Amino acid sequence: MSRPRILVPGKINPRVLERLPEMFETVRIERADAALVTADMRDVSGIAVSGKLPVPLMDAFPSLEIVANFGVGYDGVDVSRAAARGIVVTNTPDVLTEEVADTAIGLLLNTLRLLPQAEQWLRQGRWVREGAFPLSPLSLRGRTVGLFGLGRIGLAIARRLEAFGVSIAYHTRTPREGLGFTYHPTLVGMAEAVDTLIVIVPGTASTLKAVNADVLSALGPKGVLINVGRGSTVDEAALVTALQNGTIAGAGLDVFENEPNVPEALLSFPNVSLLPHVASASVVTRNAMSDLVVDNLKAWFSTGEALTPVAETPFRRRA
Amino acid sequence: RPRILVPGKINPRVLERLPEMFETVRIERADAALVTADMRDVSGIAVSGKLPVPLMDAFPSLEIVANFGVGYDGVDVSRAAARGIVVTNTPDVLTEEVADTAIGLLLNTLRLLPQAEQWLRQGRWVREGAFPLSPLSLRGRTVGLFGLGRIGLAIARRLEAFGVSIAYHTRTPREGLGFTYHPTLVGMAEAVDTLIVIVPGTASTLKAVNADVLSALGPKGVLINVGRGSTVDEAALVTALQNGTIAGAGLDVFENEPNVPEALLSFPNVSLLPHVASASVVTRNAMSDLVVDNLKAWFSTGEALTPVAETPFRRRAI
Numbered sequence: 001m002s003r004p005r006i007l008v009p010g011k012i013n014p015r016v017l018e019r020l021p022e023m024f025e026t027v028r029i030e031r032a033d034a035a036l037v038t039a040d041m042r043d044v045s046g047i048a049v050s051g052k053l054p055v056p057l058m059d060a061f062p063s064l065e066i067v068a069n070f071g072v073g074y075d076g077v078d079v080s081r082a083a084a085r086g087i088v089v090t091n092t093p094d095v096l097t098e099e100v101a102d103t104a105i106g107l108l109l110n111t112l113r114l115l116p117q118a119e120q121w122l123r124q125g126r127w128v129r130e131g132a133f134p135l136s137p138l139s140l141r142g143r144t145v146g147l148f149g150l151g152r153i154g155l156a157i158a159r160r161l162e163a164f165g166v167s168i169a170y171h172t173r174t175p176r177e178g179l180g181f182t183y184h185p186t187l188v189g190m191a192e193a194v195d196t197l198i199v200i201v202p203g204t205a206s207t208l209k210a211v212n213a214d215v216l217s218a219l220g221p222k223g224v225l226i227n228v229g230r231g232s233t234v235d236e237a238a239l240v241t242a243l244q245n246g247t248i249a250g251a252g253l254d255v256f257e258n259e260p261n262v263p264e265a266l267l268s269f270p271n272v273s274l275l276p277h278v279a280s281a282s283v284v285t286r287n288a289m290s291d292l293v294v295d296n297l298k299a300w301f302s303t304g305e306a307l308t309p310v311a312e313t314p315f316r317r318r319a
Numbered sequence: 320r321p322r323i324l325v326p327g328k329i330n331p332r333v334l335e336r337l338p339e340m341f342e343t344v345r346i347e348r349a350d351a352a353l354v355t356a357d358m359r360d361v362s363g364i365a366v367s368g369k370l371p372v373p374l375m376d377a378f379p380s381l382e383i384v385a386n387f388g389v390g391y392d393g394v395d396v397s398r399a400a401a402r403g404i405v406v407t408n409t410p411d412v413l414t415e416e417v418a419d420t421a422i423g424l425l426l427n428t429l430r431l432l433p434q435a436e437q438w439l440r441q442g443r444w445v446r447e448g449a450f451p452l453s454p455l456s457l458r459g460r461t462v463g464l465f466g467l468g469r470i471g472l473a474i475a476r477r478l479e480a481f482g483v484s485i486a487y488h489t490r491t492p493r494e495g496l497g498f499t500y501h502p503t504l505v506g507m508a509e510a511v512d513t514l515i516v517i518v519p520g521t522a523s524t525l526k527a528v529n530a531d532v533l534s535a536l537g538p539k540g541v542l543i544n545v546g547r548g549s550t551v552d553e554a555a556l557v558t559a560l561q562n563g564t565i566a567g568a569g570l571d572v573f574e575n576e577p578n579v580p581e582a583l584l585s586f587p588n589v590s591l592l593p594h595v596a597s598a599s600v601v602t603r604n605a606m607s608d609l610v611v612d613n614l615k616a617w618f619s620t621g622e623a624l625t626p627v628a629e630t631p632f633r634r635r636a637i
């Protein structure tokens with residue numbers, strides 16, 4: 001009744017750890033690994049986690065009620081298996097929307113105008129010896145942007161893009177009514193129509209390698225791909241080929257198939273910007289994400305209703 | 320065919336198009352000592368950057384200086400006006416491009432994206448894990464625009480979509496816009512935490528961003544300069560960054576380009592670009608076209624396309 005025990009496997013923002021003592025006992029393990037679970041941990045009622053939650057770790061806890069996922073994406077939790085056990089899963093929507101949308105525009109501008117490379121040119125002393133940084137072959141001016149995904153974050157990206165004077169289209173499974181953006185019922189169809197593709201869908205079975213050779217070919221030789229969603233959504237091998245052959249003109253990636261590993265071939269290109277999954281990674285936004293993780297757990301145990309349960313687990317607490 | 324002097328470096332598109340109507344005369348530096356007796360019939364100049372007065376005054380038949388760039392502080396416009404010489408610039412065709420760079424630089428300064436990319440490229444994501452969280456963010460910021468002209472307004476339009484508060488300082492307020500006007504720069508700096516400089520480099524803006532303005536901007540303060548480097552007291556900025564008087568800075572322009580002081584290079588909270596705000600192929604092509612089309616319009620019709628405010632002149636031949 002009094003204090004529930006919460007497991008935290010691996011690294012998490014210290015703000016989560018700082019706030020859990022408001023209601024909970026915290027149990028830490030150094031890695032998300034079932035082999036680290038001891039007999040004394042079998043009474044754990046909740047998990048707070050960033051990234052992967054292996055099924056054998058989740059299933060090591062007979063009294064588990066709730067997984068509070070740090071992040072709006074929760075593809076590291078086996079939600080099917082959670083639902084089958086009656087375990088509620090919560091995520092962190094909304095509190096990071098604007099931050100992520102800001103990073104998406106930054107990455108887009110860096111990709112098109114080569115601003116990081118320009119800064120390196122200056123910092124390495126090349127402005128003095130060799131003169132002006134080369135003119136960027138690309139620009140945002142005159143571009144047509146297609147958003148793959150138009151949810152919380154996709155719409156926030158579209159709102160920014162409206163102020164840059166570019167045409168905007170989108171592809172989702174179901175159109176969003178009331179908005180003045182051109183809907184495309186197929187991804188490849190949108191890709192044909194646009195020269196700039198921004199990926200902001202979840203990493204599910206339905207989006208797995210959706211950005212493939214055909215979509216990239218359709219995007220075309222002025223084509224720029226921006227991925228701020230999940231790396232699984234892009235066929236990473238096909239992207240490398242497309243960049244090698246000049247099938248597309250450039251790419252900016254915050255996410256990858258097998259993080260933190262980025263293939264050497266992607267690192268070679270002068271027309272590519274790469275970030276280590278930083279789209280929400282400010283102090284203020286990660287603090288808000290931490291707060292929402294903890295407030296989800298507090299709401300669950302005190303009222304029986306989570307703040308932001310995921311669609312797959314619209315559960316209420318039975319105790 | 321009028322003879323056009325081009326001193327020093329210019330976009331090859333200018334040089335490609337001048338033969339449509341003109342004879343081109345090249346000198347390798349903007350230096351009067353390189354002018355020969357044969358060049359004394361030159362009717363026009365096309366120039367990027369500085370045009371020294373002794374070079375300008377080496378040409379008795381000079382009619383027009385077509386400046387490459389919307390900024391024309393490298394031309395002595397007072398002396399040009401006193402000789403009846405029209406000066407043209409390249410407004411409008413670079414406005415959106417420059418506004419794009421201003422936002423890019425702002426985001427890079429706040430979120431440390433270039434440094435995050437370096438962390439990845441140097442193999443640190445694999446060995447040491449996540450790039451450190453950026454202490455700063457755009458979220459919750461209040462932006463003050465020093466200058467709100469063609470480019471300043473285009474920047475404000477972008478910022479409106481980022482959900483930040485917007486204020487501005489100009490000598491005269493702009494009516495009809497919903498942004499908070501400040502009659503003094505220091506007053507705006509007190510009210511905001513993010514200062515974007517987009518004024519021309521004139522006597523009136525010279526070191527306007529000084530120790531007092533930076534102190535007023537405050538310890539969460541971020542300075543972005545995409546105007547001219549002369550507008551910022553570069554020495555005072557270095558001191559302010561050293562002392563923690565402000566939180567960060569993003570600079571596209573500097574007091575003595577291409578030289579950037581070593582102290583500015585040292586800071587982890589600073590983004591630096593080599594004057595790239597308009598430097599795309601498409602935008603520089605449009606700037607080149609406008610330089611040439613100004614000269615063509617002047618010599619064919621007697622009316623320039625984009626003369627500067629100081630020289631609202633029409634051609635008198637002979």
Ligand SMILES: NC(=O)c1ccc[n+]([C@@H]2O[C@H](COP(=O)([O-])OP(=O)(O)OC[C@H]3O[C@@H](n4cnc5c(N)ncnc54)[C@H](OP(=O)(O)O)[C@@H]3O)[C@@H](O)[C@H]2O)c1
Nearest residue numbers: 073149150151152153172173174201202206228229279280
């Ligand atoms: N880089 C980062 O650090 C970072 C940060 C935050 C989020 N993210 C990623 O961004 C994702 C989206 O976040 P959000 O808050 O915007 O979520 P959201 O509000 O649920 O939006 C998801 C969008 O994707 C669309 N979608 C899903 N499956 C689709 C499919 N198979 N085909 C076409 N459209 C599809 C949805 O429309 P329909 O359902 O109608 O198809 C919806 O428009 C997260 O799941 C996360 O993986 C990454």
Ligand SMILES: NC(=O)c1ccc[n+]([C@@H]2O[C@H](COP(=O)([O-])OP(=O)(O)OC[C@H]3O[C@@H](n4cnc5c(N)ncnc54)[C@H](OP(=O)(O)O)[C@@H]3O)[C@@H](O)[C@H]2O)c1
Nearest residue numbers: 390466467468469470489490491518519523545546596597
């Ligand atoms: N980094 C780059 O590559 C790059 C590219 C393009 C332009 N620029 C620079 O940006 C400048 C602005 O371009 P623009 O097309 O926006 O020019 P603009 O349309 O003439 O706008 C200039 C703005 O500055 C204000 N201003 C001028 N002197 C001022 C003073 N002493 N105090 C306060 N406000 C002052 C003007 O308002 P008031 O007259 O009412 O004071 C006006 O709002 C250029 O002159 C150039 O130096 C740099």
Ligand code: NA
Nearest residue numbers: 192194219220
């Ligand atoms: Na296309």
Ligand code: NA
Nearest residue numbers: 509511536537
């Ligand atoms: Na302030």
